[PDB]
Amino acid sequence: SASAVCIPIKNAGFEEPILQIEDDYTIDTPPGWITYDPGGLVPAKRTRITSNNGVGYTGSNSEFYNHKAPEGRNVAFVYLAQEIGSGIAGLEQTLDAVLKPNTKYTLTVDIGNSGGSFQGKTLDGFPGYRIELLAGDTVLAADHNTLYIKEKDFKSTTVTFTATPESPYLGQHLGIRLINPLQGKFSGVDFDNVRLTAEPAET
Template sequence: MRRTFLAVALAISASAQAAPIGVVNAGFEADFAANNTFPVLIPQGWTVYDPDGIYNNSNRAVGVLNPTGSTFFPGGAPEGNNVALTWLDDGDLNNQHMGLTQVLTTDLAPSTHYRLSVEVGNIDSGTGSPPFDVFGFFNIQGFPGYAVQLLAGGVLLAEDNNSLGATLAEGTFGTSVVEFVSAANVLPGQALEIRLINLNLPGTPGNPGIEVDFDDVRLAASPLAVPAPALPPLLGGALCAWLAAARSRRRLM
């Protein structure tokens, strides 16, 4: 009987375990970047999020950065070698947002707890390695703010709107966490989506706040556990099944 109870308990527990949801190029390693370089490109698997129409692939751009051996992030990337960069160097466009987005192949499920975590970086000033040294020294002091969003069917479910912004030191990363619990009934066909946004908050000449970096995007889903009131009937059913089997064995002996 103990084995029966244990099996039922394990089945209940397993149903509530978090399962990872696939994110293409979640660590931004698919595009090569040499140490201390920052190619301007759209990372594979992602598209530009540009609600204000400001992206120009120049002073308003996205790309990847390999901070190994640099002053940008002395500790390197949180995961792998690369991080994603979102660069907005235009003081006339303060508060106009831009970033990266990815629509996943997984739809929103009912009665599910979602947990999205992303490493968010406040880049420090520095100079790239050749041939990127031609751009000279970058004063990237300050922080323009960020948002990490989880959506389904294009509708915002939950977000972290710059909760780390006031405490994230230059040249470091912090973990942004966004959580959402779906309703028992959801419309089918609502694809999940992740957005990583540079909020482009106003800076100062000494602290312009131009770039936000992102890395190690992880999304997990956990079906809601069986409510406590439902456990006794479930375990009782297992006990009845065990007793019935025991009686059958005794009759056969």
């Protein structure tokens, strides 16, 4: 951890684009990230009532969380309007760094369970979450909904992965997926503070 190094990630805290009004949010894919929608659940033209993703201002007076964003003023969100078990969707980003042998990777991200209500619709419930670390288009490691996150709360999850010399994915581009697996309603989940460190692998 003392010799840990950070792997560069674009818009890691979803601080772009800048917002100012409490509870304000966009419905466009946050800059630096791309929408992960293998089942085409996110419409070409998005509206506030369709499946969508974006950044949301989360200050100390947020209606959805007891505290402000874990990092900065913004958190990213992924909302799916389809029925439970209809599929999965989220944010994804390919990194410049490649997988190196004898290296332990530590991927940490804060998961938010929005609570309260919006326009008469309750935010009670949670669709779960899944964090993935990739090499190429292969999922090296993932944590699927193991954390318990209370409503209006944010919780840190950690995904580790050690690349050995026998790995077949050495030299492939690293990647990160923030997924909403749609396993419950209200089907919205927030993320923030994406961090990816690398260090010498365990002896």
